[PDB]
Amino acid sequence: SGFRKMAFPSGKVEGCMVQVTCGTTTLNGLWLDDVVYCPRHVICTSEDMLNPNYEDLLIRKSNHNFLVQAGNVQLRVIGHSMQNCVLKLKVDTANPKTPKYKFVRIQPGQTFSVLACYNGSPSGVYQCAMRPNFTIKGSFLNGSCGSVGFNIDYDCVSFCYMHHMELPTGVHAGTDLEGNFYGPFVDRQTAQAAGTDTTITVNVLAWLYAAVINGDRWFLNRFTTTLNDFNLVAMKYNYEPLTQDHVDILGPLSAQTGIAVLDMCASLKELLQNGMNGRTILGSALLEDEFTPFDVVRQCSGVT
Amino acid sequence: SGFRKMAFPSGKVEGCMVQVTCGTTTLNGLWLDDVVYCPRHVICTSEDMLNPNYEDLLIRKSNHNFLVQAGNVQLRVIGHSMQNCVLKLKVDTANPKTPKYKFVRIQPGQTFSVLACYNGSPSGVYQCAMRPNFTIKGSFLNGSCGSVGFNIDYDCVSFCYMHHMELPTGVHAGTDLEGNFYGPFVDRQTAQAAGTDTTITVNVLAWLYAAVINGDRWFLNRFTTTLNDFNLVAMKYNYEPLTQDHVDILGPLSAQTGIAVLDMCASLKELLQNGMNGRTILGSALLEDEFTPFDVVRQCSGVT
Ligand SMILES: N#Cc1ccccc1C[C@@H](N)C(=O)N[C@H](Cc1ccc(Cl)cc1Cl)C(=O)N[C@H](CC(=O)NCCc1ccccc1)Cc1ccc(F)cc1
Ligand SMILES: N#Cc1ccccc1C[C@@H](N)C(=O)N[C@H](Cc1ccc(Cl)cc1Cl)C(=O)N[C@H](CC(=O)NCCc1ccccc1)Cc1ccc(F)cc1
Ligand SMILES: [Cl-]
Numbered sequence A, B: 001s002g003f004r005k006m007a008f009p010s011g012k013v014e015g016c017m018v019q020v021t022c023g024t025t026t027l028n029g030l031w032l033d034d035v036v037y038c039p040r041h042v043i044c045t046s047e048d049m050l051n052p053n054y055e056d057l058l059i060r061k062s063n064h065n066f067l068v069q070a071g072n073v074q075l076r077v078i079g080h081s082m083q084n085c086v087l088k089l090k091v092d093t094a095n096p097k098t099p100k101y102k103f104v105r106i107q108p109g110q111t112f113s114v115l116a117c118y119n120g121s122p123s124g125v126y127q128c129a130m131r132p133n134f135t136i137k138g139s140f141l142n143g144s145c146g147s148v149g150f151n152i153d154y155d156c157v158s159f160c161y162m163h164h165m166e167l168p169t170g171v172h173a174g175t176d177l178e179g180n181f182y183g184p185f186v187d188r189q190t191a192q193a194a195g196t197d198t199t200i201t202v203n204v205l206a207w208l209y210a211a212v213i214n215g216d217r218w219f220l221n222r223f224t225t226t227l228n229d230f231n232l233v234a235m236k237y238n239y240e241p242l243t244q245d246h247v248d249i250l251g252p253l254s255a256q257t258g259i260a261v262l263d264m265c266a267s268l269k270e271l272l273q274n275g276m277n278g279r280t281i282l283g284s285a286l287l288e289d290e291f292t293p294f295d296v297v298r299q300c301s302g303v304t
């Protein structure tokens, strides 16, 4: 029993982290087979960053303008290209530690593990969700750019996030591994604002089911509600509307606990209206929304 | 910026996890050089577990009674011994992935990363603290026994915990890697109760400093307090007494933020007396006590 913020084991990704240097700029890259993937703003000086023309800046670069280091071993760059906001550096050596992997672009509300890295060296791992406003509430310092987010499924690493920048509010923005930003953001050093965020309703409900699976029942009630009535309340408290697809995704948890989804929605409605009144759920004093239904199934026992 | 429950990268420990089988009993072992470390109750049947005499049970075993599997490769056991509550199995093959490592027995209040494993296969990593009552609030299912907890310092893995059992309350008990339990517990299947737990005061204070470093100041006040006056309040709210050694450990954080330790104690006193009144700190609605001063320094910027 018990319930924790749980990341995937990071070893398969640690073996892919390298350091990329262009001029005085250094950040992290991801070394898969004979290609290194990193944020394209590695080619920018501090002055370039305010308003870069990346096509202009890249045409002025050659292969020998890029330094790639794996451990204390330099990899020779033999080719380079730009794909959206990621720079690809072809190197002369295929990574012998390359895992089975895929590149995946995720939806808001999905979670992933982040391997925070500095100068090509992994320093820690944590769990994140993609917020509905396409930021993540990461933990990142200077030098973290190029750190990646991933899920693991039967020894296949699905990479879904590469870190590019911290916004004025301190949240974080980045791209899929093909260089497309999540959200409306662009890779230049200007003050960009995320849209107003919302709470991930299907995840809160998943986490309430985790609590029941762990024997925590104090918040349940005998009431139920309709989808339309619940969504009125979701709107009032800045929760994402609950869709029928999300009701269906919660099927297995509902069946393991015998609590219909719309029953749990009535408990959540009551929690939103009355607060917790000093009690906790799974050791938390607020409603947690960064566990997906998948996360709950993965971590909890298959029997309540 | 940002602040997350952050574990160490787990790769160096993943390469040491194996599966140990004795009879119908299977759990996880740790393979370092040519020795596999695992809970000694792997030699127990379900009936043996209620009241085992381990010396009696082990003398009835030979080397070929133990099956060790690393991946799909069986390791041949060539010797076995008991050290307190850990079984040591000598194998014919030294682990080529053995990291630089140490065995360390930690104090309550210290944190570590846990690599949760099933059948020798790593499934997730999370952060834990050793509670003052010598349990950990882990996330563990059947088959997790033999999972280890660790810290990493400059590529040296310090192993500090091996998982042995879940108590009736759902918290977890285990040993150092020399097989000595943390706390008063013993490895037999009886209902054992932990002592009443307390909040880790020095860690709460560390986490308040993390919040200030991240620009979160709403809880500060102009007051200060004495060590003796603070400890009166700590007693009232079931907090560990603050020692002068803990005041000293908080030195660097106090100096980076310009807030004297005893000043922060006055803020904590006010937080305990008045609650949060609906506000959050580092995204939490309760006072978090599973970040050490070291954890905060490691994760936060060196400049406020
Ligand atoms: N992670 C990360 C990271 C963090 C710090 C330094 C460096 C890095 C990595 C580094 N790589 C990077 O992200 N640097 C961007 C600048 C940048 C580079 C490159 C690109 Cl392409 C785009 C950008 Cl925006 C960066 O400094 N942002 C700051 C960070 C900041 O002051 N937070 C305060 C939050 C806060 C705290 C308390 C209270 C309220 C708020 C915010 C900002 C300011 C002006 C601006 F115009 C745009 C953004
Ligand atoms: N992790 C782990 C784990 C978890 C489940 C199954 C298996 C394992 C690993 C496995 N290895 C292991 O720990 N099994 C011990 C039994 C055991 C084996 C070997 C030794 Cl040496 C010692 C022990 Cl005690 C185990 O089943 N404990 C149960 C677990 C339980 O019912 N929690 C409910 C909490 C709860 C939930 C909701 C509300 C309130 C409370 C509690 C218990 C019951 C009777 C008793 F007498 C002693 C302990
Ligand atoms: Cl798709």
Ligand SMILES: [Cl-]
Binding pocket: none
């Ligand atoms: Cl010591």
